[PDB]
A paper describes a structure:
Here we report near-atomic models built into cryo-EM structures of procapsid I, intermediate procapsid II which has partially released the SP, and the mature DNA-filled capsid from bacteriophage SPP1. The asymmetric units (ASUs) comprise seven SPP1 [name] subunits: six in a hexon (subunits A to F) and one from the capsid penton (subunit G). [name] has the characteristic L-shape of capsid proteins of other tailed bacteriophages, with well-defined A and P domains, an extended N-terminus arm, and the E-loop.
The mature virion capsid (MVC) packed with DNA was reconstructed from images of the infectious SPP1 phage particles. The MVC has the same size and protein shell thickness as procapsid II. The opening is closed in the MVC state whose hexon is nearly flat and only 1 nm longer than in procapsid II. The overall fold of the 324 amino acids-long SPP1 [name] in the MVC is similar to gp5 in the mature empty capsid of phage HK977 in spite of only 12% sequence identity. During transition from procapsid II to the post-DNA packaging capsid state (MVC) hairpin β6–β7 of the hexons unfolds to form the A-loop, which turns outwards closing the hexon central opening. Subunits A to E remain nearly unchanged during transition from procapsid II to the MVC. In contrast, subunits F and G undergo a significant structural rearrangement similar to the transition of subunits A–E from procapsid I to procapsid II when the SP is released. Gp12 binds to a ring of six Glu197 that converge from the tip of the A loop closing the hexamer central hole. The major structural change found in hexons of the mature capsids is the outward motion of the A loops, probably caused by DNA packaging inside the capsid, closing the central openings and creating the binding site for the gp12 trimeric auxiliary protein.
Residue numbers in the entry:
A (entry chain E): 110 to 324
B (entry chain E): 2 to 55
C (entry chain F): 56 to 217
D (entry chain F): 272 to 324
Write the structure that this text describes.
């Protein structure tokens, strides 16, 4: 067993890092009116995510534009996109299924994105639009990055990892409140509340918009 | 009578292990986050450790 | 046959006044089935000499291609079993019943993406005649034309059709 | 003739069958198969639909 698990350990950390990232963004835009200018909401049951609302999100930065490049996505979303993509001209059927780019913009497909649930079986999707390149982070180092020990009288053997890293957008200033510690913060606590931006107007650079999927 | 499949004894078989791979593809890369600066490096390497700078 | 499922779990809050805990690995099982079949046939004799040719010769000549349709019969049976009435499979199936929805141009896309991230592991599509027909009659362009295209149309969208 | 066939795919289970072996046609279709992977890499999908009016 130890051989196998040791073989797999490497790619494990990836999904952890990702888990952190989505958490932290969710925090940044959480419930802070200071950010209202960078977000958009299509909820209340009208609006489909098509071809227009996308444009609004694109221009939500008024003068500066084309600092946006790549679009976050979820499967079913891209699906609905396709089923509206079908031309009447031309044809049934030639095109098509997968379509990078969308409009002069990269697209990245992933199955794991924040998805909430209300009653009445109404799904809601997020789909960050960043095109940033980027936020920032640095590796950092501990001491004793890897070690192995064993219980001598019982029969066991172990592995450990324990790595440091530093990550945040600049971007909003971090604040100290409502946290035990310290440090680090936490997952939940890193998402909890109380971040305060200062620039403001532009050059963040990220926008999110929530939308219902096409009927 | 018969040789009667109730009689000669049938073995069983095995082959070595094969590693399964759980799949939910984790990318959401490349994007923010990327692009380490020198400053967050000034957080990174010792000495003058945390907590975090300003 | 066995397998070893891959590891997962949280990192942790690396912290003093406390220690870590190691973690574990699991295993799993898989099965299969052996099956076996056969049949026979025969004739009279008097009939053979009185009829002007030999039945046994003919039937022996045809025997070969016979087994095909049997194998097929097995296959459809077994798939029908796999997806039968087992909620464990719900994620791989779709139902358009209740009298709305036509099989056109969209639902097909849904079926295509019913595997969310991984895709293009799908290649060829099963079909029935009348289905392909209805496909064609919706395939008629308004542009262009009446009439140039068309009847048979492999591929459908970048996908084989049988 | 003998032959062996199955997807891997769902694990086969032993229930509700006389025998043995093989199973049967009907019995091979009857019930009680239990998958383990799960999520993906089966790889097959079916969908039922009414024909165009």
């Amino acid at each position: 067993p130890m051989q196998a698990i040791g073989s797999r350990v490497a790619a494990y950390w990836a999904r952890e890092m990702q888990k952190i990232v989505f958490a932290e963004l969710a925090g940044v835009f959480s419930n802070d009116d200071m950010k209202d200018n960078k977000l958009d909401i299509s909820g209340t049951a009208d609006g489909i995510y098509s071809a227009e609302t996308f444009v609004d999100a694109s221009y939500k930065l008024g003068d500066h534009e084309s600092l946006l490049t790549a679009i976050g996505m979820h499967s079913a979303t891209m699906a609905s996109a396709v089923k509206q993509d079908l031309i009447e001209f031309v044809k049934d059927s030639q095109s098509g299924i997968r379509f990078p780019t969308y409009m002069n913009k990269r697209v990245i497909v992933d199955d794991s994105m924040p998805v909430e649930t209300l009653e009445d079986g109404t799904k809601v999707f997020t789909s960050y639009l960043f095109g940033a390149g980027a936020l920032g982070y640095a590796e950092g180092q501990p001491e004793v990055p890897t070690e192995t020990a064993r219980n001598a009288l019982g029969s066991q053997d172990i592995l450990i990892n324990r790595k440091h890293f530093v990550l945040h957008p600049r971007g909003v200033k971090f604040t100290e409140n409502a946290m035990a510690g310290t440090t680090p913060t936490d997952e939940e606590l890193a998402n909890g509340a109380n971040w305060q931006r200062v620039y403001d107007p532009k050059k963040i650079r990220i926008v999110q918009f929530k939308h219902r999927l096409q009927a | 009578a018969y040789t009667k499949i109730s009689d000669v004894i049938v073995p069983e078989l095995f082959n070595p292990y094969v590693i399964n791979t759980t799949t939910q593809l984790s990318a959401f890369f490349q994007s923010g986050i990327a692009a380490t600066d020198d400053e967050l490096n000034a957080l990174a390497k010792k000495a003058g450790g945390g907590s975090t700078l300003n | 046959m066995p397998y070893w499922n891959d590891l997962d779990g949280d990192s942790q809050v690396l912290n003093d006044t406390d220690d870590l805990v190691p973690q574990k690995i699991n295993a799993g099982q898989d099965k299969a089935v052996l099956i076996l079949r056969g049949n026979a046939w025969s004739s009279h004799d008097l009939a053979a000499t009185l009829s002007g040719s030999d039945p046994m010769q003919a039937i022996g000549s045809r025997v070969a291609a016979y087994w095909a349709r049997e194998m097929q019969k097995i296959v459809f049976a077994e798939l029908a079993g796999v997806f039968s009435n087992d909620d464990m499979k719900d994620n791989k199936l779709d139902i358009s019943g209740t009298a709305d929805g036509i099989y056109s141009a969209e639902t097909f896309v849904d079926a295509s993406y019913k595997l969310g991230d991984h895709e293009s592991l799908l290649t060829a599509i099963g079909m029935h005649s009348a289905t392909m027909a209805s496909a064609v009659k919706q395939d008629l362009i308004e542009f262009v034309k009446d009439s140039q295209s068309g009847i048979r149309f492999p591929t459908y969208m970048n996908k084989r059709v049988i």
